[PDB]
Design a protein around this ligand. Structure first.
Ligand SMILES: O=S(=O)(N1C[C@@H]2C[C@H]3CCNC[C@]2(C1)O3)C(F)(F)F
Ligand SMILES: O=S(=O)(N1C[C@@H]2C[C@H]3CCNC[C@]2(C1)O3)C(F)(F)F
Ligand SMILES: O=S(=O)(N1C[C@@H]2C[C@H]3CCNC[C@]2(C1)O3)C(F)(F)F
Length: 130
Protein backbone atom coordinates (compact mmCIF):
# COMPACT_ATOMS: atom_id res chain seq x y z
CA UNK A 1 0.00 0.00 0.00
CA UNK A 2 0.95 3.74 -0.23
CA UNK A 3 0.85 3.81 3.60
CA UNK A 4 3.47 0.97 3.74
CA UNK A 5 5.74 2.85 1.22
CA UNK A 6 5.40 5.97 3.47
CA UNK A 7 6.50 3.80 6.49
CA UNK A 8 9.69 2.61 4.66
CA UNK A 9 10.46 6.23 3.50
CA UNK A 10 10.31 7.38 7.19
CA UNK A 11 12.63 4.45 8.12
CA UNK A 12 15.23 5.58 5.47
CA UNK A 13 15.05 9.26 6.68
CA UNK A 14 15.70 8.04 10.32
CA UNK A 15 18.61 5.74 9.26
CA UNK A 16 20.33 8.46 7.12
CA UNK A 17 20.19 10.90 10.13
CA UNK A 18 21.69 8.34 12.64
CA UNK A 19 24.43 7.38 10.06
CA UNK A 20 25.46 11.05 9.34
CA UNK A 21 25.71 11.70 13.18
CA UNK A 22 28.14 8.69 13.47
CA UNK A 23 30.12 9.71 10.29
CA UNK A 24 30.90 13.29 11.49
CA UNK A 25 32.27 12.09 14.96
CA UNK A 26 36.12 12.40 14.79
CA UNK A 27 36.52 9.07 16.75
CA UNK A 28 34.88 7.13 13.86
CA UNK A 29 36.84 8.52 10.89
CA UNK A 30 38.58 5.10 10.26
CA UNK A 31 35.06 3.55 9.72
CA UNK A 32 33.84 6.19 7.12
CA UNK A 33 35.30 4.66 3.90
CA UNK A 34 36.28 1.24 2.57
CA UNK A 35 39.86 0.05 3.24
CA UNK A 36 42.15 1.04 0.29
CA UNK A 37 43.39 -2.30 -1.23
CA UNK A 38 46.65 -0.48 -2.26
CA UNK A 39 47.60 0.59 1.32
CA UNK A 40 46.32 -2.75 2.85
CA UNK A 41 46.33 -5.70 0.35
CA UNK A 42 46.01 -8.21 3.27
CA UNK A 43 42.64 -6.67 4.44
CA UNK A 44 40.39 -8.62 1.99
CA UNK A 45 42.22 -11.98 2.62
CA UNK A 46 41.35 -11.63 6.40
CA UNK A 47 37.90 -9.90 6.28
CA UNK A 48 35.41 -11.77 4.12
CA UNK A 49 32.53 -9.14 4.24
CA UNK A 50 33.99 -5.60 4.52
CA UNK A 51 31.58 -2.83 5.72
CA UNK A 52 31.86 0.95 6.37
CA UNK A 53 29.55 4.00 6.90
CA UNK A 54 29.73 5.20 3.20
CA UNK A 55 28.58 1.69 2.07
CA UNK A 56 25.74 1.87 4.72
CA UNK A 57 24.50 5.21 3.20
CA UNK A 58 24.57 3.59 -0.29
CA UNK A 59 22.59 0.53 1.04
CA UNK A 60 19.87 2.80 2.65
CA UNK A 61 19.36 4.50 -0.78
CA UNK A 62 19.24 1.06 -2.57
CA UNK A 63 16.34 0.06 -0.17
CA UNK A 64 18.44 -2.77 1.36
CA UNK A 65 17.10 -2.14 4.93
CA UNK A 66 13.37 -2.71 5.71
CA UNK A 67 13.91 -2.77 9.53
CA UNK A 68 16.25 -1.13 12.12
CA UNK A 69 17.31 -4.77 13.06
CA UNK A 70 18.80 -5.29 9.52
CA UNK A 71 20.61 -1.86 9.75
CA UNK A 72 22.09 -2.82 13.20
CA UNK A 73 23.45 -6.12 11.67
CA UNK A 74 25.70 -3.93 9.39
CA UNK A 75 26.77 -1.61 12.37
CA UNK A 76 27.64 -4.87 14.26
CA UNK A 77 29.69 -6.10 11.18
CA UNK A 78 31.73 -2.81 11.09
CA UNK A 79 32.57 -3.40 14.81
CA UNK A 80 33.27 -7.19 14.58
CA UNK A 81 35.52 -6.70 11.45
CA UNK A 82 37.69 -4.14 13.40
CA UNK A 83 37.93 -6.51 16.46
CA UNK A 84 39.08 -9.42 14.14
CA UNK A 85 41.57 -7.41 11.91
CA UNK A 86 43.16 -5.50 14.90
CA UNK A 87 43.26 -8.12 17.78
CA UNK A 88 46.75 -7.61 19.40
CA UNK A 89 47.88 -5.91 22.68
CA UNK A 90 49.73 -2.97 21.09
CA UNK A 91 48.31 0.56 21.44
CA UNK A 92 47.31 0.94 17.75
CA UNK A 93 45.05 -2.19 17.89
CA UNK A 94 43.66 -1.29 21.35
CA UNK A 95 42.72 2.27 20.14
CA UNK A 96 40.75 0.95 17.06
CA UNK A 97 39.01 -1.71 19.19
CA UNK A 98 37.93 0.99 21.75
CA UNK A 99 36.65 3.20 18.84
CA UNK A 100 34.77 0.19 17.21
CA UNK A 101 33.01 -0.59 20.54
CA UNK A 102 32.13 3.15 20.97
CA UNK A 103 30.63 3.24 17.38
CA UNK A 104 28.42 0.22 18.17
CA UNK A 105 27.43 1.50 21.67
CA UNK A 106 26.65 5.01 20.32
CA UNK A 107 24.43 3.62 17.47
CA UNK A 108 22.47 1.41 19.91
CA UNK A 109 22.08 4.33 22.45
CA UNK A 110 20.69 6.76 19.76
CA UNK A 111 18.23 4.03 18.62
CA UNK A 112 17.12 3.26 22.25
CA UNK A 113 16.39 7.02 22.86
CA UNK A 114 14.90 8.00 19.39
CA UNK A 115 13.29 4.89 17.73
CA UNK A 116 9.66 4.20 18.78
CA UNK A 117 9.35 0.41 19.51
CA UNK A 118 5.90 0.37 17.73
CA UNK A 119 7.44 1.93 14.52
CA UNK A 120 10.05 -0.90 14.47
CA UNK A 121 7.33 -3.58 15.08
CA UNK A 122 5.28 -2.13 12.16
CA UNK A 123 8.32 -2.38 9.79
CA UNK A 124 8.93 -6.02 10.97
CA UNK A 125 5.22 -6.96 10.26
CA UNK A 126 5.24 -5.36 6.75
CA UNK A 127 8.65 -7.23 5.99
CA UNK A 128 7.11 -10.59 7.21
CA UNK A 129 4.01 -10.08 4.93
CA UNK A 130 6.10 -9.74 1.68
O1 LIG B 1 31.61 14.03 5.17
S1 LIG B 1 32.82 13.30 5.56
O2 LIG B 1 33.82 13.90 4.65
N1 LIG B 1 32.64 11.60 5.28
C1 LIG B 1 32.83 10.90 3.99
C2 LIG B 1 31.83 9.69 3.98
C3 LIG B 1 30.89 9.69 2.84
C4 LIG B 1 29.60 10.19 3.36
C5 LIG B 1 28.53 9.10 3.39
C6 LIG B 1 28.51 8.16 4.59
N2 LIG B 1 29.77 7.66 5.12
C7 LIG B 1 30.61 8.60 5.79
C8 LIG B 1 31.00 9.89 5.15
C9 LIG B 1 31.81 10.73 6.11
O3 LIG B 1 29.85 10.62 4.70
C10 LIG B 1 33.25 13.64 7.26
F1 LIG B 1 33.04 14.99 7.54
F2 LIG B 1 34.59 13.32 7.46
F3 LIG B 1 32.49 12.90 8.11
O1 LIG C 1 19.37 -4.24 21.73
S1 LIG C 1 17.92 -4.30 21.55
O2 LIG C 1 17.64 -5.59 22.16
N1 LIG C 1 17.55 -4.42 19.90
C1 LIG C 1 16.60 -5.40 19.36
C2 LIG C 1 15.47 -4.46 18.91
C3 LIG C 1 14.66 -5.00 17.83
C4 LIG C 1 15.34 -4.55 16.61
C5 LIG C 1 14.59 -3.43 15.95
C6 LIG C 1 15.26 -2.07 15.80
N2 LIG C 1 15.82 -1.42 16.96
C7 LIG C 1 15.51 -2.16 18.14
C8 LIG C 1 16.26 -3.45 18.26
C9 LIG C 1 17.54 -3.28 19.02
O3 LIG C 1 16.59 -4.04 17.02
C10 LIG C 1 17.08 -2.95 22.40
F1 LIG C 1 17.90 -2.51 23.39
F2 LIG C 1 15.88 -3.37 22.95
F3 LIG C 1 16.85 -1.90 21.54
O1 LIG D 1 47.36 -11.20 11.83
S1 LIG D 1 46.43 -10.37 11.05
O2 LIG D 1 46.59 -10.55 9.57
N1 LIG D 1 46.70 -8.72 11.40
C1 LIG D 1 46.34 -7.62 10.50
C2 LIG D 1 47.08 -6.38 11.11
C3 LIG D 1 48.33 -6.04 10.38
C4 LIG D 1 49.35 -5.87 11.42
C5 LIG D 1 49.43 -4.42 11.91
C6 LIG D 1 48.30 -3.87 12.80
N2 LIG D 1 47.84 -4.70 13.91
C7 LIG D 1 47.02 -5.85 13.56
C8 LIG D 1 47.49 -6.79 12.47
C9 LIG D 1 46.96 -8.19 12.72
O3 LIG D 1 48.93 -6.76 12.46
C10 LIG D 1 44.79 -10.69 11.52
F1 LIG D 1 44.44 -11.95 11.18
F2 LIG D 1 44.08 -9.76 10.81
F3 LIG D 1 44.68 -10.46 12.86
Amino acid sequence: SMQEEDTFRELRIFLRNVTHRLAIDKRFRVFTKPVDPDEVPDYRTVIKEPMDLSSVISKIDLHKYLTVKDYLRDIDLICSNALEYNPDRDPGDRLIRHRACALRDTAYAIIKEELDEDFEQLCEEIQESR
